[PDB]
C-alpha cells in the first residue's frame, strides 16, 4: 500500500491514485514574487476558543490530533473562504533533517516541517460528503522552523512515546492548538488537493507566511516515531512529506502587500 519510500512513495502513487497527476494538486511551491496581493481577500477568522480534542492516533504515515466536530466548536471561516468550515484534525509533515520536511515551499526554500489544521465545509454536512466537493476543505498550513521551542507544542511532543507505532491511540483532551498559531494571519491562498492518497481535489489551501520556531529536541521526538506496527522491523517515521506539483492553470494569492 502506500507511503514514502523507494517503492511505495509519491513517484508510485499515480498508479492506484491516478488523480496525483490532476489539475489542482498539492502541494506547491510559492514562488512570493508571482503571487499577487488580492485586495478582494478578507482577515482570516481562526475561532479556536471551545475547540475540543480528543485523542492523538499514529494511523502509520504521521500522527492526528483529532477534534470533536459534531457541533460548531472550532472554526474557520473570512479569508478566501465562504462559509463556515469546523476543525477535525491537525497533523505534521517533516523531515529526517532540518533542511527538509515541508510539503510547501516558499521560493524554493524548504521549512523543517509543516502543520495541517484540517476543516470541512459544514454546507456538506460531514467530512464524507465534504471530500466530494470541490470546497469541501480548508487547510491551514503553517511551517515549522527549527530554534526556540514552541511551548504550545509540549505537550503533543510528550505524548509522541506512548503512540509509537502504527494504530495506537492515546487520549488527548484539553489541547488548545491556539498555542500553534504564530502571530501573524498574513497568508498566501490556492485551490489544491490533499497532499497523501487520495489526494481529492478539495482543499482551498491557506499556508501562512510566517513560520513557528520549534527547538531541535521538538522535531527530534517526531522523528522517534515508527511508520510500522508493533513487533515489526523499525522503520523511523521521517521524511512523510509530498514534492512540490505542478502549479498548472492556478494562481496563488497572497492577503497581504
Ligand atoms: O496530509 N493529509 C492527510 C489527509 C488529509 C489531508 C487534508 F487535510 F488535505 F484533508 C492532509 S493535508
Ligand atoms: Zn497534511
Request: proline letters at 7%.
Amino acid at each position: 500500500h502506500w507511503g514514502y519510500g523507494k517503492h511505495n512513495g509519491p513517484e508510485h502513487w499515480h498508479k492506484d491514485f491516478p488523480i496525483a497527476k490532476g489539475e489542482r494538486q498539492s502541494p506547491v511551491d510559492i514562488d512570493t514574487h508571482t503571487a499577487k496581493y488580492d485586495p478582494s481577500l478578507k482577515p482570516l477568522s481562526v475561532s479556536y476558543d471551545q475547540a475540543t480534542s480528543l485523542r492523538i492516533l499514529n494511523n502509520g504515515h504521521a500522527f492526528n490530533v483529532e477534534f470533536d466536530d459534531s457541533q460548531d466548536k472550532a472554526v474557520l471561516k473570512g479569508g478566501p473562504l465562504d462559509g463556515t468550515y469546523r476543525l477535525i484534525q491537525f497533523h505534521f509533515h517533516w523531515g529526517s533533517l532540518d533542511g527538509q520536511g515541508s510539503e510547501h515551499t516558499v521560493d524554493k526554500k524548504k521549512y523543517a516541517a509543516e502543520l495541517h489544521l484540517v476543516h470541512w465545509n459544514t454546507k456538506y454536512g460531514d467530512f464524507g460528503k465534504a471530500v466530494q466537493q470541490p470546497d469541501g476543505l480548508a487547510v491551514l498550513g503553517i511551517f515549522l522552523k527549527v530554534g526556540s521551542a514552541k511551548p504550545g507544542l509540549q505537550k503533543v511532543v510528550d505524548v509522541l512515546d506512548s503512540i509509537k507505532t502504527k494504530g495506537k491511540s492515546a487520549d488527548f483532551t484539553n489541547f488548545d492548538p491556539r498555542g500553534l498559531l504564530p502571530e501573524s494571519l498574513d497568508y498566501w491562498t490556492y485551490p489544491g488537493s490533499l497532499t497523501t492518497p487520495p489526494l481529492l481535489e478539495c482543499v482551498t489551501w491557506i499556508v501562512l507566511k510566517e513560520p513557528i520556531s520549534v527547538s531541535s529536541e521538538q522535531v527530534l521526538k517526531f522523528r522517534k516515531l515508527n511508520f510500522n506496527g508493533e513487533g515489526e522491523p523499525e522503520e523511523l517515521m521521517v521524511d512523510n512529506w509530498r514534492p512540490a506539483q505542478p502549479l498548472k492553470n492556478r494562481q496563488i494569492k497572497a492577503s497581504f502587500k
